């Protein structure tokens, strides 16, 4: 399938990234070991329970097993294992393994496309980790719950709403991210639907919610008669006009992640437009405003959690991303500069029962949901970035 062609902005005064110093073993253990101490702080906090998506006044409130985001909590407990290899987690996180198998068994509010945020670094994590069956068995689960929103007519998986119901006809960037659990069922199965699947959403979503200047809408709308793409639209962002951050990431990390699995070259192209876009648009300390559109002075809030997710696509990408790539070493430098301003000027210092790992993310700006607030899924990535850079990690994706 041919993807249209975007335009690859080249990243602007490179020297910003390349000037930088590497991040050093102790600095990323050092960060992995300021983590822990919030992650162990907060296992009593929550107990059986979980996190709410975003923080108040940063602390985390306690909720049940009903949202988008419990899996990221999990896979913040199942990242702690693999640095500490220390029982006590895998205890926790596998109880939330079985109350995600529940989850699944019975159907409980999982009428949306998030079945990979919330199986993958949970059950998908465990499976990879020790290969508990009752894990394995959750996320094939899983799949099938999420292939159900599968649609022929325009070959992509459908989000939340009433499904093939032209108001809602639509898919959403973060999918990107949950095609991953389809491709892990393939390979696990031998079964071509989740891989064809997988595929044709990949591209419907290249295609479409990846624009011509490689900036990202959030929704992109399909015909549900002819199949034909219909429109895009930017949730989210601050205007029609700008660029969240957060739908940029989830483009950066869903394009190599997919690249693992289908190996088109397309791919890297696309992955190249979408970062030096973001690149483009980071501020002086290399973090992501909330929307691409605010730099220094601003005085909007930063989206830490979209800067985590770019860092982890970027780290994904170089593992592929040929040697004579005139920017692969600029890539490398700018995870490591953007890293480290999360590391040294992001990360909670304040160890009470609650905070997050990560500061400053904006969940959803005009719903006035976690702005300025730590978030689940950004505490994930982070982590993530620090166990990406610190081990050979196996990926839970």
């Not at 390349?18 to 600095?27: F, G, W």
């Not at 990323?28 to 983590?35: D, S, Y």
């Amino acid at each position: 399938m041919k993807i249209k062609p975007v335009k690859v902005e080249s990243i602007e005064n490179p020297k910003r990234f390349l000037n930088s110093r590497l991040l050093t073993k102790i600095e990323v253990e050092e960060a992995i070991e300021k983590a822990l101490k919030q992650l162990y702080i907060n296992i009593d906090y929550f107990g059986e329970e979980y996190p709410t998506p975003a923080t108040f006044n940063n602390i985390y409130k306690v909720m049940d097993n009903t949202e988008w985001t419990n899996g990221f909590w999990t896979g913040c407990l199942w990242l702690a294992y693999e640095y500490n290899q220390d029982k006590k987690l895998k205890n926790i996180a596998h109880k939330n393994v079985l109350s995600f198998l529940n989850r699944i068994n019975n159907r409980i509010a999982l009428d949306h496309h998030d079945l990979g945020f919330l199986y993958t670094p949970s059950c998908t994590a465990e499976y990879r980790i020790n290969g508990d069956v009752k894990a394995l068995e959750a996320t094939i689960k899983a799949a099938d719950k999420l292939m159900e929103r599968y649609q022929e007519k325009g070959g992509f998986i459908q989000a939340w709403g009433e499904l093939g119901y032209k108001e809602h006809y639509r898919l959403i960037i973060d999918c990107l991210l949950n095609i991953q659990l389809l491709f892990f069922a393939y390979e696990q199965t031998g079964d071509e639907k989740y891989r064809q699947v997988a595929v044709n959403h990949f591209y419907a979503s290249a295609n479409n919610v990846v624009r011509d200047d490689s900036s990202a809408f959030h929704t992109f709308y399909f015909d549900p008669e002819t199949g034909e793409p219909l429109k895009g639209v930017t949730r989210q962002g601050y205007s029609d006009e700008s660029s969240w951050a957060r739908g940029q990431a989830w483009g950066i990390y869903g394009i190599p992640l997919s690249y693992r699995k289908m190996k088109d070259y397309q791919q890297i192209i696309l992955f190249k437009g979408m970062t030096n876009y973001f690149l483009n648009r980071l501020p002086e300390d290399k973090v992501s405003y909330w929307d691409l559109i605010f730099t220094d002075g601003s005085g909007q809030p930063r989206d830490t959690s979209a800067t985590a997710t770019a860092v982890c696509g970027i780290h994904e990408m170089l593992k592929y991303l040929p040697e004579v790539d005139p920017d692969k070493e600029t890539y490398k430098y700018a995870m490591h500069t953007m890293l480290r301003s999360l590391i040294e000027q992001y990360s909670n210092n304040e160890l009470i029962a609650g905070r997050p790992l990560l500061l400053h993310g904006v969940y959803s700006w005009h719903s006035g949901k976690g702005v300025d607030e730590g978030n689940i899924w950004g505490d994930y990535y982070y982590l993530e970035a620090l166990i990406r850079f610190y081990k050979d990690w196996e990926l839970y994706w």
